[PDB]
Nucleic acid binder design. Structure first.
Length: 155
RNA sequence: UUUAGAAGGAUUGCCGUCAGGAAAUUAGGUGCGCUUAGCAGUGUACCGCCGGAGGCGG
C-alpha cells in the first residue's frame, strides 16, 4: 500500500473530465488486466455528492513496491505530457480512502426516476471493444480498507 | 353586565306615434447611439444479466 500521484493540470483548454475519460482510463484498463492483480485508484480531493468533482489529482493504490513499479506509469501516460503529470516517488501513504462503484438501474424502456438523480450526482465514459456501446460508470468513496479491472472494488 | 331585551311589508300591471346637421381650411424648421465579450456546464447515460420481483458483468 504505497503510492504514485498523477496530476491533471488545470487551465489547458479541455475540461479535466474529458482528459480523465479519453487518455487515462484505456491505458489503465490495459495496465490493470495484464497485471490482473486487483489494484485501485485514489481520487483525492473527491469533494461533494452534490458535486461529483472528481478533482485534478489521481493516485494509484498498490501493495508491493515492485508492486506499483509493476506498472510503468511513466513511459505510458507519457506522450500526453502537457495535460497529465507523472510524479516520481512511491510514497507509503496511510491516510488513503478507498473508492467503490455504485450502479443506478437501467431505463424504463430498456421507480426508474427514483434511482435516477440519486447516483447521477462521477459518470466516466468508456467505449467497449466487443459490444461497441459506450456507457457511464459511477463511483463512490468508502471505508473497507483491504478490486476489479476498472480499479474500483469488486462487486 | 353595551339608548338593554322583541319583530314576515305584501299582492297586480301594454310607454308610445313622427323626423335632412351643414358649409370652409398650409403643421412646420434642426440634429453623431455606443465602447466590451469563449454555449458553457458533463451534454447525457448502452446492451445485457439473472432472477421473477430483486441483484452484478463488459
Amino acid at each position: 500500500m504505497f503510492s504514485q500521484i498523477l496530476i491533471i493540470k488545470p487551465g489547458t483548454g479541455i475540461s479535466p473530465n474529458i482528459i480523465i475519460s479519453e487518455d487515462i482510463f484505456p491505458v489503465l484498463h490495459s495496465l490493470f488486466v495484464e497485471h490482473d492483480k486487483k489494484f485501485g485508484i485514489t481520487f483525492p480531493a473527491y469533494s461533494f455528492d452534490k458535486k461529483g468533482h472528481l478533482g485534478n489529482i489521481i493516485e494509484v493504490l498498490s501493495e508491493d513496491k515492485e508492486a506499483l513499479a509493476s506498472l510503468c506509469l511513466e513511459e505510458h501516460l507519457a506522450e500526453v505530457t502537457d495535460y497529465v503529470k507523472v510524479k516520481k516517488e512511491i510514497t507509503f501513504t496511510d491516510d488513503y480512502v478507498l473508492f467503490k462503484r455504485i450502479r443506478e438501474e437501467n431505463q424504463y424502456e430498456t421507480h426508474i426516476k427514483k434511482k435516477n438523480q440519486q447516483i447521477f450526482c462521477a459518470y466516466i465514459k468508456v467505449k467497449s471493444a466487443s459490444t461497441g456501446q459506450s456507457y457511464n460508470i459511477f463511483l463512490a468513496p468508502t471505508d473497507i480498507k483491504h478490486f476489479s479491472a476498472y480499479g474500483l472494488l469488486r462487486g
